[PDB]
């Protein structure tokens, strides 16, 4: 009874709450049910400990798992739908000394991916961003922390450029999104489709745009670079604290600087900071020391403002609803390319880049705090 | 019975005075019982030879081990109590030509998990420990050999962050702490549920917090870090005698250096020394050879104070009263992150960190001796 | 499965437009088939998504792949020699969220068998080509994806050296490069005539020249090696992406390292770079660091004049007009044979040959970029 109601009730709300994840997680006497909302788990409900196993068996069914294989941890995919609700789930079940556990991660659709316009870049760098991502060929990187939008930006760009005339071709594991116009290839070690193999397949597929879900394999750093040189547009993902580091990372991973230089068109770093919920938005003031570090001066600081939430139903009482992306844009030109071929470091490139207009990740963040998206605190609190 | 009371009482003293282990050994009238309090097998008491069977039968009957079996070894788990103590032990016995031997290991209960404030950090390093482990995301490494205090540090941090409202998924083999609010997977080869398989599921299962009791499987090291890279807060336990080299060790475990860089919030190397009993502390010379080897300053020698234990009864007659943890904390800012992605060694990472003010394991320990808590020599014995 | 209707209409159009590739794109509700011409795609037709699965399934049959196997993707060459439409296709059923994408890359026809002077060899690789092919003993291996002219050149070797004084016999799958006056055999796996089996007979013929159309089978790697080992010129297509890697590749395929070195005399990799159409030969004088990092002799980096096609209504506006061959023949001597047994990296064994006069593909292609034939980017794209 309760077990069947339970699985579907949590899943239904997870989509409605836009939880990124659904948890059915057993404890000593009961099961704590939690939804990952705006990047963090919070309680939803509880199951009786007995209901737990009935519940886990039900989700194994929901994801297509082998219901009989209760010794080994398993996973699969739930095409969970309810009325207008439609988000695939990645279901994973696991034994616990407290009974079986199950979690259903929300996977996404083309309709969840923001337009390139919805990504959150400062307008200055955004127009330059669009100019870089619109290039007929060349390396464009999107790098950084969880939820940063490395994936969403990558796909916002890929969808934009996945026009009738372009083989937008990607590497995902499993496919994260359901998107038309783009060949969303899934990594499959049984087939030999490792990330490096999947990019070898990318070139064999005669592509227009590469998407490397994460450039982990050294070979993917090189293949993505080759792709750029071969006349493909290259979009690839890393985890860096800045754009100059991401270029540096292409060299740290073994990509020759003469290719990075010829191929590179721009590097983007990106991260998430909480967004103030509109239903409770209120004007507050910023910390002037941070603002002085931005170069704002007393002259502009005197009129500076930040926003926070007062709390509302939309934000779950936290004052914030969703998180927004912050962007660093290393638009690449001749001086940067001369620095790259020479083998220059992230610091050396960064100095050129800022002189050339590279609004920094931190700066775009603090800027968005100042433009009313967030607070000059959350920005600082989500980096290293 | 005398044996049952003996066992409950020795266990109480062992936990109360901080033994790592309880040693009950074969002797021809009488049985020698020692407690490894503060690392030394301090004498505790004795029993008639026939007590080897009565007392060990208690160790086994409680452990869940077969009493009659005296040829093959056994290893169990018991929640034991007397006086101020109610704490878990591992229970094991050894087949012996002279009659069995039994030793019980001082596991702590979930309810005994210390606040991070209770881990022995001086206020300075403490605030940094707190700031590191409380980072909204990333991996914290806890390192060292038998006698380092890893499980308390490991679980202390967990106590602070894995509230009942947060999803947590822990790997143990077998379970030591249990711990409502946190899902605890016990590794089970019957299934094929390795630490790696346990984490394979944890990753797909999206907990906020991941804990691994021992990073032994390569895949386990990688996954725990993978989550930590972008947003999960991860606690990992492993063997290393240097906070910066620990980074190198995680690289050795198969975790991509770039993954480590992004994930890592800090590394703590630990060691425990004997605390001097207050009621018989002896202010010492201090010894010039011991001091020379350690490098103590006249500022310390002529004003800070080192003590030895003389004997105060309350110390088991050995002059000491419990372990004093010594802590070497590497705080991972983004310069150290750079060093990591750059492939830098402990020397390079440590030198950057010391240039930033990082206190070494010997500097901390010696301070602790100089705080009048421990002995100059106890510190020396576990460092250079 | 029709599916196949489109597969056939598409293939016919792809050849007529000289598309480099066919893209049967699995989509959300349908399948979008696109052709690649001069750096961009154009749509041809669509199929129902259900037809996609039928496409994937039938193309698997076509490639000799298992139609019943869709737990994983498959790939292979399809002998679609449909009269006027007779370019061989590289089938890659790469799995996406919408099913596998049936890419079919176009592999070239005999295209007349050239003299070695018609291949565009630099004097370095040219004279060495002449030297290597003139031999009575040893394997002359050629690399790059079919369509890059491997077999074009492989058969050029025979055209030039299979004189009335020499016993020549070749085996292919299917015969791709016919040469009048030369005895050609086609494999027949149905009979059991693997390449190895044929080559085994070739050993038995005490031939002067033994051709292998594609050294792909493990048995064949061993026998093709024996083909030369036993005292015969062997000429072969080694279907990999690098001449130097081709050496190591025989070892990768299970060929005794020793037999491989005994068996080899020269390995050529070749590619074609897109041309700059004269009009837009803009002398983008090089950054010497690019050229130096490319391993271009200092003498050459100084004489170097890099180009970039402007794009340029006569290209256009890609910056390029058609393709131009570049070459790297690793003439083999004893330094190379040491390296062959060793299984050295492509770069090092190639560099050894480079100093023998083998303008590496990077030196040669770059030299051609440096003359305005092609551009930096194309060279890097083809030579990294």
Numbering used by the authors:
A (entry chain A), B (entry chain F), C (entry chain D): 505 to 888
Source paper text:
A third vital component of the TFP biogenesis system is the assembly ATPase (PilF in T. thermophilus). The TFP assembly ATPases are part of the extensive AAA+ superfamily which form molecular motors, using the energy from ATP hydrolysis to drive mechanical transformations. The domain structure of T2SS and TFP biogenesis ATPases is similar, in that they comprise one or more N1 or GSPII domains at the N-terminus, followed by a C-terminal (CTD) and N2 domain- which comprise the ATP binding site. Here we present a combination of X-ray crystallographic and cryoelectron microscopy single particle reconstructions of the PilF hexamer in two states which are used to build molecular models for the complete PilF hexamer and chart its structural transition on binding of ATP.
